[model samples]
Target: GAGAALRQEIEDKQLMVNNLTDELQDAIDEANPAEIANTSQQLRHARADLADLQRRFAVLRNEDRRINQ
Candidate 1:
């Protein structure tokens, strides 16, 4: 139950992180100002989302551990 949800959430975030990395690399290689600006914004949002998800996951994991003990 908890394990499934946690794994799914982590996997989703990892996928997004991978996609954003590709986008960022493309933006860098293209070297266009507007595109770079857009990529920067997208990167910021993606990193924020990843951070939040990781935080939530850690909390859930700790709670699970504490409960099991």
Candidate 2:
């Protein structure tokens, strides 16, 4: 249940990251340095959050397996 919640968070972050990636590409296409910079920062943070959630989920699953064993 807790793991499920974490997974959902991860999914949400992943979607955000995907959207930011597209936005960054569009900014690049338009040659807007300011938009590119802002989107880049947001993308970085989104990726970090996704990574953190994934790490937590992995640890949670490991603990669950150990307990079940």
Candidate 3:
């Protein structure tokens, strides 16, 4: 029942991640080293967070299939 909701959350999170990457690039060109570093760190954290969520989603799906079988 919650699969759709979870996927939507991941999609939204992915959008945020894409935006952050773009912003990081822009900040780098703007010569703001500190902001660039900050955004890079934020990007790394976001990627890790996304990976964890996707892993959980995959596990959930696998379990659902097994139970249904």
Candidate 4:
């Protein structure tokens, strides 16, 4: 259940990253430099967290797989 919960959390985070990426592109399309810059900065911060989470997720997945196998 904890593993499933973590996988759900990872999915949620991935969705957030996807949304931020889309919003950033939308801002660019609108020529809103301020929004673009703001989103870009937010994305940078999110990306750092995202990378760490992804690594953790992968580690968990690998461990589970190996254990199951």
| Candidate that would win on lDDT | 2
Candidate 2 lDDT over 1-69, as tens digits, reads: 349888888888899999999999999999999999999999999998889889999999999888887
Q: Runs in model 4 with CA error above 4 Å?
A: none
TM-score result, candidate 3? 0.81
Better of 1 and 3 by lDDT: 3
lDDT assessment of candidate 1:
0.79
Task: Give all TM-scores, in the order shown.
Answer: 0.77, 0.90, 0.81, 0.81
Error of 1 at 16 (Å): 1.5
User: Residue by residue across 9-54, what tens digits does model 1's lDDT show?
Assistant: 7788788778877887888898878877887787788778878878
For candidate 3, the per-residue lDDT at 48 reads 88
Q: State residue 63's C-alpha deviation in candidate 3, in Å.
A: 2.0
**Which of the predicted structures, 3 or 4, would earn the higher lDDT when compared with the native?**
3
Residue pairs clashing, model 2? none
Model 4 poorest ten-residue lDDT run:
1-10
lDDT of every predicted structure (CA atoms)? 0.79, 0.93, 0.86, 0.84
Judge candidate 4 against the unseen true structure and give its global Cα lDDT, from 0 to 1: 0.84
Error of 3 at 56 (Å): 0.2
User: Over the stretch 6-66, how does candidate 4's per-residue lDDT look in tens digits?
Assistant: 6777788788888899999999999999999999998888878878887888888888888
- Weakest lDDT window of 10 consecutive positions for candidate 2: 1-10
